[PDB]
Amino acid sequence: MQASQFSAQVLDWYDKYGRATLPWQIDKTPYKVWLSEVMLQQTQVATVIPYFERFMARFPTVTDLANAPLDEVLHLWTGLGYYARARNLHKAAQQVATLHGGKFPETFEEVAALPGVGRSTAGAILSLSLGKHFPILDGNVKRVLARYAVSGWPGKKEVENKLWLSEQVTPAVGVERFNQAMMDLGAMCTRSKPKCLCPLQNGCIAAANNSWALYPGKKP
Ligand SMILES: Nc1ncnc2[nH]cnc12
Ligand code: SF4
Numbered sequence: 001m002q003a004s005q006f007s008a009q010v011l012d013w014y015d016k017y018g019r020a021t022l023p024w025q026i027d028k029t030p031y032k033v034w035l036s037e038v039m040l041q042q043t044q045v046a047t048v049i050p051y052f053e054r055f056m057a058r059f060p061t062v063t064d065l066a067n068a069p070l071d072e073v074l075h076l077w078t079g080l081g082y083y084a085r086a087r088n089l090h091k092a093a094q095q096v097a098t099l100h101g102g103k104f105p106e107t108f109e110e111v112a113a114l115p116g117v118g119r120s121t122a123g124a125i126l127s128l129s130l131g132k133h134f135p136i137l138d139g140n141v142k143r144v145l146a147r148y149a150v151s152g153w154p155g156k157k158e159v160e161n162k163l164w165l166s167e168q169v170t171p172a173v174g175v176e177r178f179n180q181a182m183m184d185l186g187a188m189c190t191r192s193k194p195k196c197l198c199p200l201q202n203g204c205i206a207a208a209n210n211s212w213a214l215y216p217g218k219k220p
Helices: 003-017 030-040 045-058 062-067 070-077 084-099 108-112 119-130 139-146 157-163 175-187 205-209
Strands: none
Touching (some): 045 070, 070 084, 119 175, 139 175
């Protein structure tokens, strides 16, 4: 499907079903988006909501998080699992306080340099909070794009580079809505039995061939 049509269809879909009412989607700031992305990396949205609210109440700013004892951060994280995220979260907060005077960085390199934040997460933080022109590529997005019929295992460098398709379909105008739409689409284009309610159904190769099971490829 033509890139221009891909982004246009996803944006039109988001405008009608794009439920952007979650806490981290209102009065967005790099800090709030970063915090939510880290919590959402390996935890379901329903579970994350109360923690996000608790964290924002206890740590209104990144400096408050940086100055808090690690033990307190880990205690509040209890129940989210995958604590390496919490440890990196605290280190990143301290890096922001130390290197950026407490102002969460708004430039890609400085964001990506934070512990626990990669190319995709950095792109998400800046695109969603400031509308900066960056594409994303998490598990949800890989699924949607792979189902352009990319059958290789994303674990392979060449396949990962191929998927990073994301750049081609991601627009600058409306990037915040498009990136959120892609994540919503992949989360609600599911692993099993996708609900091809999808704005890409008229051009998706997997849908046309009823072959979604082949994309993305599984670890060989
Ligand atoms: N923006 C987002 N909305 C819902 N689930 C997500 N998982 C990762 N990012 C997400
Ligand atoms: S049409 Fe179906 S398989 Fe294709 S992107 Fe949409 S949900 Fe996924």
